[PDB]
Amino acid sequence: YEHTAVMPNKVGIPYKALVERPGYAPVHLQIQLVNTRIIPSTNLEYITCKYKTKVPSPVVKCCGATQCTSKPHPDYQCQVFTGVYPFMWGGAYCFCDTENTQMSEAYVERSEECSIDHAKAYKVHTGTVQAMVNITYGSVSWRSADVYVNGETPAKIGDAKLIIGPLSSAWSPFDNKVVVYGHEVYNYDFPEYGTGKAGSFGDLQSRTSTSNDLYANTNLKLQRPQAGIVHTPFTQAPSGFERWKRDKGAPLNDVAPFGCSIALEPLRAENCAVGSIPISIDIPDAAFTRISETPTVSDLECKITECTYASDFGGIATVAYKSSKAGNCPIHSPSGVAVIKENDVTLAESGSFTFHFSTANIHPAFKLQVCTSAVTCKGDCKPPKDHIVDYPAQHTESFTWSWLKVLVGGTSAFIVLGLIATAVVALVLF
């Protein structure tokens, strides 16, 4: 009875399959993939952030040169300068006039915001998707367990053992290269650690926040201070983290395909509704009811009464239940045409009880399996009026004949008329 089932990946709607174990009473499923959080395999490549030109205070030798050295600070820009007369609180102070030397030095350093307000690159691989699958199973009525997708993992939370996937729809909405910012995730071809052109994204490139080493292509170019005054012209591109916040691109939780949401959390991409998942469960046999205890319902009748050709469970149908005992009776349409709100219907001795459903074909010819008794609930449905609210329960759109059957049979009849005109020429011929 290990109920294999292909199953559409779509988050917020149950999938009430039916256990057709030969021998005991069937049991309904209610499989609602409440989440599809993904968590691909990734690597923190480098944080970036806006620089801070935290200038070390320049040297001023008063009469003669002070050669600078290339200190190992990140982007340690330093350039000696002469020809000053530095006004500092008493007019100038160095008594020479050209031998007055000024050595400006400036290096790049992570902002204090780099710790907290910082973009974040990644090389993103595929990893392994997850879900907090609720099943309000059978008569168990509850399990809300976190599972995987890899098609040999069980999760014995509750009483049932369930194996999921692997899904066929391997679209990781994340690209290979991704930038991340607070919550807005950008599938951006970040240049790399160690390279980013100044002004462009990643002018500062630190491996992490702690990492004292980094790459600071900021094009930091010191210029000489003006007219004999102490200061430090640092001519520099404002960061490619400054832009990338107001000339950026839009976020993947606002531009992704196939229906995903995002978090700066384990880097999941929630609720990506795409494709199917081959899911298979091993129910506890104790949860089964033996077949000789549920009422046999046959010699019944089913009919719609007001079928709504729609998403919300607007379709209804009375069923002339013809029971043997009285009790519960799990229900399901093995055809995917009709999706039913009720998993189970209570029964007195051969009464009648309407259920709710939703379909997509004007003439819903769907079987209904009322606890081992099939029936066609044939009929016709009506379109609604009021379509602006969240997502459907129908999810069964397919091909849905009033000018096709005798039309194309009539279309054929012209060319069918041919070879009964031709080869009757053969008879008139002989």
Partner 1 sequence: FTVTGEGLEYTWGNHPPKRVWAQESGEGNPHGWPHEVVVYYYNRYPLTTIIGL
Ligand X SMILES: *[C@@H]1O[C@H](CO)[C@@H](O[C@@H]2O[C@H](CO)[C@@H](O[C@@H]3O[C@H](CO)[C@@H](O)[C@H](O)[C@H]3NC(C)=O)[C@H](O)[C@H]2NC(C)=O)[C@H](O)[C@H]1NC(C)=O
Binding site for partner 1 (CB under 8 A): 254, 259, 261, 273, 309-312, 362, 380-385, 387-392, 394-395, 397, 402-403
Angstrom distances, CA of residue 62 to CA of 89, 167, 208, 210: 16, 74, 41, 39
Site for a copy of itself in 132-151 (CB under 8 A): 148, 150
Closest approach, Cβ 255 to a copy of itself, in A, equals 25
- Contact between residue 330 and residue 301 where contact means Cβ atoms under 8 Å apart: no
Q: Any contact of residue 76 with a copy of itself (CB under 8 A)? A: no
Closest approach, Cβ 392 to ligand X, in A, equals 16
Q: Any contact of residue 34 with a copy of itself (CB under 8 A)? A: no
Closer Cβ to ligand X, 11 or 370, answer by number: 11
Q: Any contact of residue 36 with ligand X (CB under 6 A)? A: no
Phi-psi region of 158 (alpha: psi -120 to 50; beta: other; left: phi over 0): left
Other C-beta atoms closer than 10 Å to the C-beta of 299 total: 12
Closest approach, Cβ 42 to a copy of itself, in A, equals 8
Q: Label the pairing between strands 77-82 and 177-181.
A: unpaired
Q: Any contact of residue 153 with a copy of itself (CB under 8 A)? A: yes
Contact code string over 122-161 relative to ligand X, x by CB under 6 A: ----------x-x-x-------x-----------------
Chosen from ligand X, partner 1, a copy of itself, none, partner binding at 183 (C-beta under 5 to 8 Å by type): none
Closest approach, Cβ 358 to ligand X, in A, equals 16
Closest approach, Cβ 408 to partner 1, in A, equals 12
Closer Cβ to a copy of itself, 189 or 349, answer by number: 189
Task: Candidates 61, 73, 123, 143: give the one binding a copy of itself (CB under 8 A).
Answer: 123
Angstrom distances, CA of residue 410 to CA of 275, 406, 407: 39, 5, 5
Chosen from ligand X, a copy of itself, partner 1, none, partner binding at 102 (C-beta under 5 to 8 Å by type): none
Closer Cβ to partner 1, 114 or 262, answer by number: 262
Task: Candidates 9, 32, 48, 187: give the one binding ligand X (CB under 6 A).
Answer: 32
b/e sequence 307-337, b meaning 16+ C-beta within 10 Å: bbbbbbbbbebebebbbeeeebbbbbbeeeb
Closest approach, Cβ 138 to a copy of itself, in A, equals 19
Task: Candidates 138, 173, 191, 330: give the one binding a copy of itself (CB under 8 A).
Answer: 191
Partners of 161 in the beta sheet? 282
Task: Give dist(CA 404, CA 323) in Å, integer.
Answer: 40
Chosen from a copy of itself, partner 1, ligand X, none, partner binding at 127 (C-beta under 5 to 8 Å by type): a copy of itself
**Residue 136, SS3?**
coil
Chosen from a copy of itself, partner 1, ligand X, none, partner binding at 19 (C-beta under 5 to 8 Å by type): none
- Contact between residue 236 and residue 88 where contact means Cβ atoms under 8 Å apart: no
Task: Give dist(CA 80, CA 235) in Å, integer.
Answer: 15
Q: Any contact of residue 205 with ligand X (CB under 6 A)? A: no
Chosen from ligand X, a copy of itself, partner 1, none, partner binding at 43 (C-beta under 5 to 8 Å by type): a copy of itself
> Residue length, the chain?
430
The residue to which tokens 């298979």 are assigned: 280
Closest approach, Cβ 195 to a copy of itself, in A, equals 4
Cβ-in-10-Å burial (0-12, 13-18, 19+) of 116 comes to exposed
Q: Any contact of residue 287 with ligand X (CB under 6 A)? A: no
Q: Which residue is nearest to ligand X (CB)?
A: 134
Closer Cβ to partner 1, 256 or 340, answer by number: 256
Give DSSP secondary structure letters for 309-354: -SSSS-EEEEEE---SS-EEEE---SSTT-EES-SEEEE-TT-B--
Partners of 162 in the beta sheet? 281
Closer Cβ to ligand X, 92 or 132, answer by number: 132
Task: Give dist(CA 198, CA 138) in Å, integer.
Answer: 62
Instruction: Please give the sequence-ordered ranges of beta strands (E in DSSP) within 164-314, or none if there are none.
Output: 177-181, 184-186, 204-206, 214-216, 221-222, 234-235, 261-262, 269-270, 276-282, 301-308
Closer Cβ to partner 1, 36 or 206, answer by number: 36
The residue to which tokens 């050669």 are assigned: 67
Q: Any contact of residue 34 with ligand X (CB under 6 A)? A: yes
In the complex, the residues that contact ligand X under the rule CB under 6 A are 32, 34, 132, 134, 136, 144
In the complex, the residues that contact a copy of itself under the rule CB under 8 A are 41-43, 123, 125-128, 148, 150, 152-155, 191-195
